Each structure stands twice: as structure tokens, then as C-alpha cells.
Design a protein around this ligand. Structure first.
Ligand code: HEC
Ligand code: HEC
Ligand SMILES: [Zn+2]
Lengths: 136, 136
């Protein structure tokens, strides 16, 4: 019951972005510029509908470089994936969690069935474990 | 003669993002977090083809707030638009340039036929006047 690599995610809907800089409590490991993407099924869930199985959210994390009062995207550090499967992933709330180092399909990171990822997202039980909100 | 408001641009492919902070040359009026979106026709040009008529790039500009060393997106300040049409927009290199205040259709910002936008973009003559490059 592994989470699939989300092929083609870069074509998906861009939900939002945030920058985490040194000093912030999530600097390790989430420091950098990140972008959140969602496929069609996740949008139904984000819109205030419910999440169909098959919904996928991606957190795409880049290192940044400071260039004359601009922050410029550098190398991809990793992508984080949540894949909705109420029955397959019922142990962590109906979402499977995986990380891919540098976004590579062969660099799977999660060793504990996603319990560590879930421990934090569990704080968002109310929104079905998703922190991101749709915007305009 | 007028650049069309790009309805539905938020659905399009997210090319890249960048943060421009106070002190940067472009702070006024491009300061903030911006995201670049391309429709299907613009992707063809970004990937190395010619840009077809009908190609559209949008620069989506948000204010941000610094909160405990995170930069969080706030309100949309404006969108900048480039619309390809080699004949109609011949005076400005075949792209028409428009700004929409707060991303609203009724708030047109350009008052000089796009000459001011064109003058800086002319530096990228070699890449069909587009600064952004596809990344993975
Ligand atoms: C708190 C200590 C966290 C841990 C550990 C993990 N995540 Fe998380 N995640 C966190 C926050 C605050 C956010 C929102 C960021 C924003 O821009 O608002 C996220 C977001 C995700 C997303 C995007 C979907 C969403 O819930 O907003 C994904 C796909 C995601 N996170 C996956 C993920 C994985 C795979 C983790 C373990 C390897 C993981 N997260 C841990 C907070 C925390
Ligand atoms: C230099 C003095 C500029 C002026 C005046 C304008 N633009 Fe521009 N633009 C500039 C840069 C350096 C970039 C790249 C930003 C990045 O993230 O790399 C941009 C980008 C755009 C885009 C995105 C497509 C691209 O060329 O990369 C659009 C749609 C765009 N700019 C529109 C635009 C309009 C409408 C302007 C006058 C109101 C305008 N720009 C001025 C540099 C400069
Ligand atoms: Zn300076």
C-alpha cells in the first residue's frame, strides 16, 4: 500500500505558495519556497465538497537564493504527497503520506507508514487533515 | 487593440514564482510574491517552439506578510498580461501588454499602449521578449 509517484503533478492546479526562512520553527526540514498542487479530485475536496478517493495533494519544496532583494527558486529539495484512499490508508486518516527526495520517484523517504507526517496533519482533523485553503 | 482579460488564468500551468522584496529595482510596482502562468499556446513557445497567436502569459502579483520568518501571501495587487498577436500588437513586438489592478477586469493600468512594459521586455528580444524559462 505505497503512495504512487504523482506523475504530471506540475500540470495540476496551483493552490498556493509560502516561504519558510531561517528562524521559523519549520526551517528543518521545510525551509525554502513551497508550492501546493492539487489534481481535479482534490479540488472537489478543497472547494468544500468531500474528497473522492484518488485525490492527490503535492507540496513541492525548493531551496531559494537571495539575489539583490529577490528570493529566486533554486534546486528542488523534495516533494511531499498525500493520496486519498479512505480504506487503503485508514490508519493515517484516509490519506497516504510519502516523500520523494529531490522529487525523484526512487528516493522514497517515509519509513514509518506515514505516522510522523500524520502526527502533525492530525491537528487539522476538522478540514480532513489538509492545511492549505483555496484562494482567488 | 485592447488586451483581453485572461479569464480562467488561475487554472493554467504554473511556470515559476519569485519574491521581490523592498530595495529591489522592480519593487515599484512589482514588489511582492509573483507567480507566472501560461496557457497551452504559451507553453509551446516556452518549450522552444514559436509563440502562436493566442498565447497568453500572466504575472500574478500578491502582497505578502512577514510573520515569524515565514512569507505568507496576502492580497492580490495586480496581474500583468502578455497576449500574443503578431499583427495587432506589431508596435510592441507582437505581444500586447496590459495590467489589471487587483486582477479586476475593469481596472486597466497601462496608459501608453504598453510602450513602457515593451521597453524593458525588449532586452529579451532573443527569447521572443519573455523572461521566464520553464523549469522542472
Ligand atoms: C508539522 C510538523 C508537519 C509535518 C511533520 C508534516 N507536515 Fe505536511 N504540512 C504542514 C503544514 C503547516 C502545511 C501547509 C503549508 C502551507 O503552505 O499552507 C503542510 C502541507 C502539506 C501538503 C499540502 C496539502 C496540505 O495539507 O496543505 C502535503 C502534500 C503535505 N503537507 C505532505 C506531508 C508529508 C508527505 C509529510 C511527512 C513526510 C508531511 N507533510 C509532514 C505541516 C506538517
Ligand atoms: C523591467 C524594467 C520590466 C518592466 C517595465 C516590465 N517587466 Fe514584465 N517582467 C520583467 C521581469 C524581469 C520578468 C520576469 C519575472 C520572473 O519571475 O522571472 C517579467 C515577467 C513578465 C511576465 C511573465 C512572462 C515573462 O516574460 O517572464 C508578464 C506577463 C509581464 N512581465 C508583463 C508586463 C506588463 C504588462 C508590463 C507593463 C505594465 C511589464 N511586464 C513591465 C521585467 C519588466
Ligand atoms: Zn540593498
Amino acid at each position: 500500500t505505497k503512495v504512487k509517484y504523482p506523475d504530471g503533478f506540475r500540470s495540476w492546479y496551483h493552490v498556493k505558495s509560502m516561504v519558510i526562512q531561517p528562524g521559523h520553527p519549520l526551517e528543518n526540514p521545510f525551509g525554502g519556497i513551497h508550492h501546493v498542487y492539487a489534481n481535479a479530485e482534490a479540488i472537489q475536496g478543497l472547494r468544500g465538497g468531500n474528497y473522492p478517493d484518488g485525490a492527490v495533494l503535492v507540496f513541492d519544496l525548493f531551496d531559494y537564493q537571495e539575489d539583490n532583494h529577490a528570493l529566486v527558486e533554486g534546486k528542488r529539495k523534495l516533494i511531499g504527497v498525500m493520496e486519498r484512499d479512505a480504506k487503503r490508508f485508514s490508519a493515517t486518516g484516509g490519506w497516504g503520506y510519502e516523500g520523494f527526495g529531490e522529487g525523484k520517484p526512487d528516493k522514497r523517504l517515509v519509513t514509518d507508514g506515514g505516522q510522523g507526517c500524520f502526527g502533525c496533519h492530525a491537528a487539522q482533523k476538522e478540514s480532513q487533515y489538509v492545511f492549505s485553503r483555496l484562494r482567488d
